[PDB]
Design a binder for this molecule. Structure first.
Ligand code: IY3
Lengths: 155, 39
């Protein structure tokens, strides 16, 4: 099987080798954001990972099995974005999330700005659990970027 | 055609850099999965 951890999502269809995003391998399932893969199958060495679940509105997709990540921000504590920028080493950034207030409830949000290909980088709590994925967000009044902490549902 | 490459362990880093604000924003999520600001 393919090792737990954080992974770059790459394509060779564009110029050279391009990082289109990032995702999480946990419990045999690969987790990323829908807008990174559009639901397409993925190669892992000589193996193929087929899409299993996805939802455009949540902007999430899982491969090889159902969504496994179920930790949630506690609403109080600092978190760490494990940013994996294109062509750059994985790096942890600690931050206190803000909040997206919506008609259907509140979710945490991280005000950190990274290239588009960093989409899908995991956000972690102090126990190392993945509380969501980075890269679906807004540009606020001063022009800066704020990403939702996007988490799926574990069945 | 897309492929994945391992980039690291998922682990909390003890002495990580600390940055970023914590804005509270009214937002709307549309059917296409796009967030927009409410004002
Ligand atoms: N604009 C910034 N200062 N930073 C962003 C940081 C991107 C981090 C990864 N995430 C993305 O690439 C998603 C894909 C689409 C997901 C949609 N479900 N992107 C976004 O969330 C937002 C969505 C905004 C929704 C508003 N309703 N898009 C952008 O920002 C693009 C953008 C916007 C303004 C200016 C620039 C300057 N190049 C770039 C950037 N594009 O470099």
């Amino acid at each position: 099987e393919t090792t737990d951890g954080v992974y770059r999502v790459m394509t060779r269809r564009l110029l050279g080798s391009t990082q289109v995003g990032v995702g999480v391998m946990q419990e045999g399932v690969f987790h990323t954001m829908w807008h990174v893969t559009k639901g397409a199958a993925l190669r892992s060495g000589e193996g193929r990972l087929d899409p299993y679940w996805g939802d455009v509105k949540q902007d999430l997709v899982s491969y090889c099995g159902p969504w496994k990540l179920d930790a949630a921000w506690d609403g109080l504590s600092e978190v760490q974005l494990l940013a994996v920028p294109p062509g750059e080493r994985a790096k942890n950034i600690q931050t206190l999330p803000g909040i997206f207030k919506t008609k259907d409830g509140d979710i945490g949000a991280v005000a950190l700005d990274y290239p588009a290909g960093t989409s899908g980088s995991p956000i972690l709590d102090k126990c190392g659990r993945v509380i969501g994925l980075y890269g679906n967000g807004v540009v606020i009044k001063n022009g800066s970027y704020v990403s939702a902490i996007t988490q799926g549902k574990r069945e | 055609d897309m492929y994945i490459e391992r980039a690291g362990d998922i682990t909390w880093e003890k002495d990580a850099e600390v940055t970023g604000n914590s804005p509270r924003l009214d937002v709307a999520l549309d059917e296409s999965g796009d967030f927009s600001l409410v004002e």
